[PDB]
Design a binder for this molecule. Structure first.
Ligand SMILES: NC(=O)c1ccc[n+]([C@@H]2O[C@H](COP(=O)([O-])OP(=O)(O)OC[C@H]3O[C@@H](n4cnc5c(N)ncnc54)[C@H](O)[C@@H]3O)[C@@H](O)[C@H]2O)c1
Ligand SMILES: NC(=O)c1ccc[n+]([C@@H]2O[C@H](COP(=O)([O-])OP(=O)(O)OC[C@H]3O[C@@H](n4cnc5c(N)ncnc54)[C@H](O)[C@@H]3O)[C@@H](O)[C@H]2O)c1
Lengths: 268, 268
């Protein structure tokens, strides 16, 4: 067994043992996968976290906002995974929005320059990463991004929700391109998870009201979710992406998979 | 009669007698409205077109990308419409994407810098215009933007479709803010219309394939539309926005109104 046996998945995200990426990576590895990692800013730190993973995995720098990193991605991955080999999976657990477009700050009040690098890192990054790595994929490969239902306005999230709405719209376009390589591109829309930086926001982080608005949003969930919703266990979201990086969901691409306890489907 | 009798609607867009904005403005005026206009780049030209309108209307410069214009909008509109008066409507007939994110150019191939000012002008502009004018609206006012169903990938449009998906997501957030002023914000999703620059693209404009891909998309429509779809008559789209700027659609905000012959609802 090993759902993901002898597969090469490259994982994005992992910033702390709290990060979802981290949890996919573990579940992934127990499942027989073989990762290669991408780090962003504090590489030495990611490095140290990455060591508690059930298995060693090469880590590589990558600021999704720097061309030369992207220019050189593919080389690097091969160079590591070893030539004559290609990868079967790529996971985009990444996003970011500046103080302003999120939190307490009124909505109309975010600078388009701020709003922008959010879009640049949260949505557009999906395309860059795919155009860059699509050339090294075995057929029947999988590309996956982490989503958060932006289909109805919620409060406090503001422009991060707008950035996700774009994510949803970019994925459809990547599905089109990946199609030619016989590779799939999909989004897993998670329920709220207590990641670190989430934690910080439900604390005083972005504001008081902002915070109390999450708290509540966070509770609507478990209520609504017919099978409930644990905001502290990213394991169910990890096993889904794990289903998607696998060959058991072969006829589905442009798609979004609600890994949310059912919440999105119930009114109250 | 005069659906829009003694109402102050400020219209965005009008670049040629072909432009939709132009058509709303006419229908608007025959309906008893009283406009005030916004021009973008070639003001003298807009000016000359604007004269064939059934009625005189003050025109004002406004590059939705220049802060000081937005900073000074409200003053200008009052200054014109005359102090002690407020407007009941605002129409956002505006958008734009650089060669690259549209047309023949592959999707992965657009620079985020290009992709960006599209987003900046097409989506984000909706928010700026609203934060700026919301202070001068009578209650039960209306804000309307022009939409184009981005809910399924289409070809050739690329990033303009992504920009509209964001538009749809911004509107929901503006509905929230407009709510406090008791003003409404909605999107009219049009079918394809032969505007000038559209014309140019179905000609050789953006590319050959790009062009032949519109042509076809353009025909799927009238087929699909149970009551059909005339790509050369922007009158039905104009009368809808006209319904929406009016008090007959009072309980509906965050919304998108399909002004499309029914196309969006039928598979084949
Ligand atoms: N946590 C939630 O409640 C929730 C729910 C549904 C979806 N998601 C999405 O899941 C994804 C995973 O994020 P998370 O919540 O695990 O949080 P997280 O704080 O662990 O960080 C996600 C990452 O963004 C990275 N980042 C920012 N700029 C970058 C850049 N230039 N290059 C590379 N990485 C960069 C950080 O290094 C970090 O890894 C997020 O994108 C989030 O939108 C999250
Ligand atoms: N034509 C269609 O098939 C179609 C269909 C559905 C929706 N829409 C939308 O309808 C809206 C109306 O556009 P149209 O198709 O009538 O085309 P159009 O070419 O008449 O131009 C729309 C406008 O964008 C303006 N523009 C660009 N940058 C600007 C700036 N910085 N400041 C102010 N104006 C600026 C131009 O001046 C022009 O008026 C568009 O936004 C389009 O997305 C169009």
């Amino acid at each position: 067994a090993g759902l993901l046996d002898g597969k090469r998945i490259l994982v994005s995200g992992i910033i702390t043992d709290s990060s979802i990426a981290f949890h996919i990576a573990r579940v992934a590895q127990e499942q027989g996968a073989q990762l290669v990692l991408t780090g962003f800013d504090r590489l030495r730190l990611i490095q140290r976290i990455t060591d508690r993973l059930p298995a060693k995995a090469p880590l590589l720098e990558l600021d999704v906002q720097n061309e030369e990193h992207l220019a050189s991605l593919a080389g690097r991955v091969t160079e590591a995974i070893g030539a004559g080999n290609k990868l079967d999976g790529v996971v985009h657990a990444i996003g970011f929005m500046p103080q302003t477009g999120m939190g307490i700050n009124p909505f109309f009040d975010a600078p388009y320059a701020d709003v922008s690098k959010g879009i640049h890192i949260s949505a557009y990054s999906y395309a860059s990463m795919a155009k860059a790595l699509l050339p090294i994929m075995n057929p029947g490969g999988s590309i996956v991004g982490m989503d958060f239902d932006p289909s109805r306005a919620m409060p406090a999230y503001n422009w991060m929700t707008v950035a996700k709405s774009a994510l949803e719209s970019v994925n459809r376009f990547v599905a089109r391109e990946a199609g030619k390589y016989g590779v799939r591109s999909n989004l897993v829309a998670a329920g709220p998870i207590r990641t670190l930086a989430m934690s910080a926001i439900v604390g005083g982080a972005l504001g008081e009201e902002a915070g109390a608005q999450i708290q509540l949003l966070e509770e609507g969930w478990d209520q609504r979710a017919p099978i409930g919703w644990n905001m502290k266990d990213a394991t169910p979201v990890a096993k889904t992406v794990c289903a998607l990086l696998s060959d058991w969901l072969p006829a589905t691409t442009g798609d979004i998979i609600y890994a949310d306890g059912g919440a999105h489907t119930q009114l109250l």
